[PDB]
Amino acid sequence: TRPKISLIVAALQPSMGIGAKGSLPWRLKNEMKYFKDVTSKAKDGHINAVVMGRKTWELIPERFRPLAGRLNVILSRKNDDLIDSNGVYHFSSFDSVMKHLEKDSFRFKDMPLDKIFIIGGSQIYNLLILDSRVDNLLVTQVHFVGEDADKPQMDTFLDWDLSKWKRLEHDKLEQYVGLDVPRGLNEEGSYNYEYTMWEKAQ
Ligand SMILES: NC(=O)C1=CN([C@@H]2O[C@H](COP(=O)(O)OP(=O)(O)OC[C@H]3O[C@@H](n4cnc5c(N)ncnc54)[C@H](OP(=O)(O)O)[C@@H]3O)[C@@H](O)[C@H]2O)C=CC1
Numbered sequence: 001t002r003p004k005i006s007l008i009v010a011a012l013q014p015s016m017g018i019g020a021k022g023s024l025p026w027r028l029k030n031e032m033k034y035f036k037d038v039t040s041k042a043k044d045g046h047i048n049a050v051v052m053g054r055k056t057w058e059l060i061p062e063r064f065r066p067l068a069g070r071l072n073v074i075l076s077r078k079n080d081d082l083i084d085s086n087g088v089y090h091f092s093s094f095d096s097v098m099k100h101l102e103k104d105s106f107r108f109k110d111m112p113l114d115k116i117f118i119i120g121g122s123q124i125y126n127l128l129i130l131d132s133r134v135d136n137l138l139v140t141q142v143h144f145v146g147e148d149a150d151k152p153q154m155d156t157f158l159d160w161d162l163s164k165w166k167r168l169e170h171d172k173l174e175q176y177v178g179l180d181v182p183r184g185l186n187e188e189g190s191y192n193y194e195y196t197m198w199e200k201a202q
C-alpha cells in the first residue's frame, strides 16, 4: 500500500444497499461529479487508479471507457495480468495487480500513482473490504426520502463491519481527496445524500 487505497461507494441507508436488479437505482448528478472529481484529483503529472470487477466495467457505458485520466484495472478470474493498448490493466486478483504495481514503483506510464480507488462490484467490495491494505472508506450515505411504497428494493449490499471503522471529520475527508466537498445532506429528487470518510478503528 504505498499509494493509499480507498473503497469508494454510494450506499443506501441503513442497510448499505448498493444495487437493485443488476444496476444502480438512483441518478444523483452531483454524486457523479464527486466520484469523477475525487477519483481524478492527483498531483501534476500523477494519476490515480480505479479498480473494478468485470461486471462494473461492463455497466459503464462504452463512451466513458476507459475512465479518462485514471488507471483502469479490471478484475476477472480469467484475466492473464495483461495491459492492453488502451492502458487498461486486466488482472486476475487484487493481490496480483498490487504486486505488479509495486515492482513498477507504483507508476503508470511514467506517472506516479497517488491513490488507488476500489470503485465497484458488490463482489469486489465485499472481498476487498476485508483486505487489510484498504486504508479508508469513502461512503456516500444515501437516504430515500420519498414514499415508502416507491423505496428502491435493494438486493445487493455492502457487507461491512461498522465496528472495524471510525468516521472522520469532514475536514479530514477534504484533506484526503484534495478538494472542497459539499458538507451535510445533498438533495436530488427522492434522495438525500452525504459524503463521508472512514478509517480503520483497530
Ligand atoms: N453503489 C455503488 O457505489 C456501486 C454499486 N454497484 C452495483 O454492484 C452490482 C455489480 O456488482 P457485481 O455484480 O458484484 O459485479 P462486480 O462488478 O463485483 O464484478 C463481478 C465480477 O468480478 C469478478 N470477480 C469476482 N470475484 C473475483 C475474484 N475473487 N478475483 C477476481 N475477479 C473476481 C468476476 O468476474 P469473472 O467471472 O470474469 O471472474 C465477477 O463476475 C450492480 O448492482 C451495480 O449497480 C457497482 C459499483 C459501485
Ligand SMILES: CCc1nc(N)nc(N)c1-c1ccc(Cl)cc1
Pocket: 008, 009, 010, 024, 031, 032, 035, 056, 057, 059, 060, 118, 119, 120, 140
Ligand atoms: C457515481 C456513482 C458512484 N459513486 C460513488 N461514490 N462511488 C462509486 N464507486 C460510484 C460508481 C457506481 C457505479 C459504477 Cl458502474 C461506477 C461507480
